[PDB]
Each structure stands twice: as structure tokens, then as C-alpha cells.
Amino acid sequence: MPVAHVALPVPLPRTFDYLLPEGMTVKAGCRVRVPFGKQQERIGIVVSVSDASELPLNELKAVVEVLDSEPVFTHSVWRLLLWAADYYHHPIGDVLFHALPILL
Amino acid sequence: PVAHVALPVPLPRTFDYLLPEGMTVKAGCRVRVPFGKQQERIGIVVSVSDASELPLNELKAVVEVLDSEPVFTHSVWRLLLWAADYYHHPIGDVLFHALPILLR
């Protein structure tokens, strides 16, 4: 009863920022393993890579491992999926992960 | 450093807020909540439980409840939620876009 769950009108990509460790590069389109909750891990997909972030670079967990060296998404498929997601109002994560099993 | 990751989260991607004391809200009401750091935003209560993914000591508190009771019909509400769910649209996206229509 004390936790009100509010729904807000967030930007296009509602991605989650994670910090990359020392000497570990990843390109937009690769899958990565990251920390969620507290002591749980989950497979994610890199959407973008910038030097900035909505939150202080001091409180963003670091990626555990990059399960990819080369984007698992076609340069075309990728550009397409992102568009699709935005155009039809679908969560980027939703499209990406649902679209992966098929692409393979 | 930063890496904008897209993850496959559950159905509602709602944001948990803490209700101050002596202030109750029904699922379907609009509320004013803190965003970013020093910014306000109008949101809608999708649900209300006693639990929360995060520590109850880290959840900002609702600032104001703009509704005594649901601005959405018991029907419309039940419908919109479905719609959002069935067609894979952000619940917040559906609710706020659907609002101007239902009223005007």
C-alpha cells in the first residue's frame, strides 16, 4: 500500500546505462551480461554508447561480460528494428529480444 | 565509458514512488512526482502494493494527488491496460495519449 507505481511518458529509448570496465569495448548491437536488482544477472543488448549519462558516472554498475565481438544484428535489420520500435510505439528492448530468436 | 543498454523488462515498466503519510491514491489517478533531480512530472498510478523492487528507503515521495478518484472509467481503464498489454505499447504512452481523447 505504500508503494505507488506511477507510469511516466519517457523518451524513445528507455535503455539502461551501464559502465564498461577497463579496456573492454563494445559496439552498438552486441549482447552483454549486466547486473540487475541486486544480485542477479541478465542478458542485455547495447543500443548506443556515449560518454555521458543521465546519472552520475559514479553510480552505474559495470557490464560483466560482452557476449559479442561483432553485432548480432544486420546493419540493415538493426536500423529497421529501431525504426519499427519508434514508429509503432514499441519498447526497444521488447522488439530487439523478440526479434532475435527469429533472425537466427 | 557509458553504454546505453536495452533490456527485456516485464509488462508494466512503471516507476515506484513512496506515498507520504495520510495520503491515499487509487489505481487510475494522476499524481505529481519528482523526476531527474529537480523537476516535476505528471504521472498516473497504475497500481499500488506494499512491496517494491527497490529499498523503500530509496523511493522519492509523491508530491500531490491530482485526483480524488479515477479519471478513467472502470471499463476504459480495464480496456486501455489490455490494449497496452496486448499490442505491446508502453502503458504510460497509452494512458497519457488516450487521456486528451477521453475528456475532450
Q: Read out DSSP for A3-51?
A: EEEEE----S---EEEE--TT----TT-EEEEEETTTEEEEEEEEE--S
Strand partners, B40: B34
Task: Note whether A40 and B96 are within 8 A (CB).
Answer: no
Q: Within an 8 Å CB–CB cutoff, is residue A57 touching chain B?
A: yes
Residue B87 DSSP class:
T
Chain A interface includes B67 (CB < 8 A): no
Pick the CATH number of B15-104 from 3.40.1440.60, 2.40.50.100, 3.40.50.410, 3.30.70.20: 3.40.1440.60
| CATH superfamily name and code, A16-104 | PriA, 3(prime) DNA-binding domain (3.40.1440.60)
Which technique?
Answer: X-ray
Beta-carbon neighbour count of residue B29 at 10 Å?
A: 21
Please name every residue paired with A70 in a beta bridge, in sequence order, or none if there are none: none
Q: Which residue is closest to A89 within chain B, CA to CA?
A: B89
DSSP string, A50-64: -S--SS-TTS-PBP-
DSSP secondary structure, B44-64, as one string: EEEEEES--SS-TTSPPBP-E
A48/B12 CB distance under 8 A: no
Quote the CA–CA distance of B47 and B16 in Å, as a whole number: 9
Q: Is B80 on the interface with A (CB under 8 A)?
A: no
> What is the Cα–Cα distance from B32 to B10, expressed in whole angstroms?
24
Kindly report the backbone phi and psi dihedral angles of residue B41, in degrees, each rounded to the nearest multiple of 5, phi listed first.
-160, 140
DSSP lists the bridge partners of residue B61 as: B18
List Cα–Cα distances, A52 to A11, A16, A30, B2, in angstroms. 16, 13, 19, 7
In chain B the first and final C-alpha atoms are separated, in Å, by 47
Specified resolution (Å): 3.3
Specify the 3-state DSSP secondary structure of B82: helix
The continuous run of DSSP H or E covering A101 comes out as: helix A92-103
Q: Testing the interface with A: which of B2, B11, B17 to mutate, by most A Cβ within 10 A?
A: B2
